[PDB]
Design a protein around this nucleic acid. Structure first.
Ligand code: A1JNC
Ligand code: MG
Ligand code: MG
Ligand code: NA
Length: 348
DNA sequence: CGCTAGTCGTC
DNA sequence: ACGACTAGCG
């Protein structure tokens, strides 16, 4: 997520009901739904008892979209990016410590506090995702596991024209350049739609409404690939890009303290991390499910070299990318857990 | 005062 | 891994 982005661009948002997309295609950031579902059966998931309540949760939202004539494409996160492996292991450690804290709370009679604890102790596994995939496939619902982040895969589906809107709780999708993003959608279909075309309605953005400048602002403000410099949020990131007249973002960032009248010494690792974050939003690997090929989100541009971009996702053979996309190949172990083949029955 | 970030409650 | 909200900083 980009902290505060939704409130900063409030004027580009409008309340909608998903009926608006009747006869259209919509891609879903399914781990958001798996998460809410896993909270509803957290005591069983953390301890180790078998449960499928999270499956019923996701299918309630899938069945609501289908009732309104919407063709949903459920996208799932895949492999972790190299730069996020310490983060994903640190998350496992906090979830296991919250499981121990919850057990301790139940022993002290604090049942309500322990039940809360368990909700922050759950791991969303590929095996949980695969159960949702199977349930959705029986209903005729297409599923796709992104090679890496679902954010990039979803942005690809929308930029390519396959889907007309992205349902997600993550404002990163706006930074990736999605045209229509549906945030805060409830089980009944009510939600907040942000349209990229309406970014011009936001007086706070000024001229920071182009895809390039908007992405730069989101990165400078603090993003999932790079924390901000201290004292920098959306208002100051936007102010810097508004005041600067220069195509080169690297020169602008070095001069950041001057534009804001702040004491900012820009570290060496900040400039490099910025270029890496920018390259991740631009060139992260996604899967074209029609041609069944692993490709970068955008075609490579003049100032980059693909061999330096392992942090944006490593290439694997197209056949391996296809087994991952169908849900047949476990994202953590690389074991073949299923044999689904779309031919012998999105991928057409 | 505008803004950012630390605290706290919950999904 | 959220947001609300306010203290407290520049
Ligand atoms: C660890 C985590 C928890 C929650 Cl509530 C939300 N996001 C989480 N993570 C991980 N994740 C997926 C795998 C994922 C989403 C939901 C649950 C587990 C994994 C993401 O999609 C993701 C982002 O895109 C982002 O910008 C920041 C953080 N996360
Ligand atoms: Mg994501
Ligand atoms: Mg994200
Ligand atoms: Na920030």
């Amino acid at each position: 997520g980009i902290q505060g982005l939704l409130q900063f661009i409030k004027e580009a948002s409008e309340p909608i009901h998903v009926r608006k997309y009747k006869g259209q295609v919509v891609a879903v950031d399914t781990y958001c739904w798996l998460h809410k579902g896993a909270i509803a059966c957290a005591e069983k998931l953390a301890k180790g008892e078998p449960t499928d309540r999270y499956v019923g949760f996701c299918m309630k939202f899938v069945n609501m979209l289908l009732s309104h004539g919407i063709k949903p494409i459920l996208v799932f996160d895949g492999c972790t990016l190299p730069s996020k492996k310490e983060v994903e292991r640190s998350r496992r450690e906090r979830r296991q410590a919250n499981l121990l804290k919850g057990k301790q709370l139940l022993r002290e009679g604090k049942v309500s506090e322990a039940r809360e604890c368990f909700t922050r102790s759950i791991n969303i596994t590929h095996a949980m995702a695969h159960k949702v995939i199977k349930a959705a496939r029986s209903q005729g619902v297409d599923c796709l596991v992104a090679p890496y982040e679902a954010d990039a895969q979803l942005a690809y589906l929308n930029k390519a024209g396959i889907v007309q809107a992205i349902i997600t709780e993550d404002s990163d999708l706006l930074a990736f350049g999605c045209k229509k993003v549906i945030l805060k959608m409830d089980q009944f279909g009510n939600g907040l739609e942000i349209d990229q075309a309406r970014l011009g309605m936001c007086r706070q953005l000024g001229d920071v409404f182009t895809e390039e400048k908007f992405r730069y602002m989101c990165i400078l403000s603090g993003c999932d690939y790079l924390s901000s410099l201290r004292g920098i949020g959306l208002a100051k990131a936007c102010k810097v890009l508004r005041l600067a007249n220069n195509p080169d973002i690297v020169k602008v960032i070095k001069k950041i303290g001057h534009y804001l009248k702040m004491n900012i010494t820009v570290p060496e690792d900040y400039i490099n991390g910025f270029i890496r974050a920018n390259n991740t939003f631009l060139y992260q690997l996604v899967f074209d499910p029609i041609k069944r090929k692993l490709i970068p989100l955008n075609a490579y541009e003049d100032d980059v070299d693909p061999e330096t971009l392992s942090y944006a996702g490593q290439y694997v053979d197209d056949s391996i990318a296809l087994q991952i996309a169908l849900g047949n190949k476990d994202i953590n172990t690389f074991e073949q857990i299923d044999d689904y083949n779309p031919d012998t029955a999105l991928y057409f």
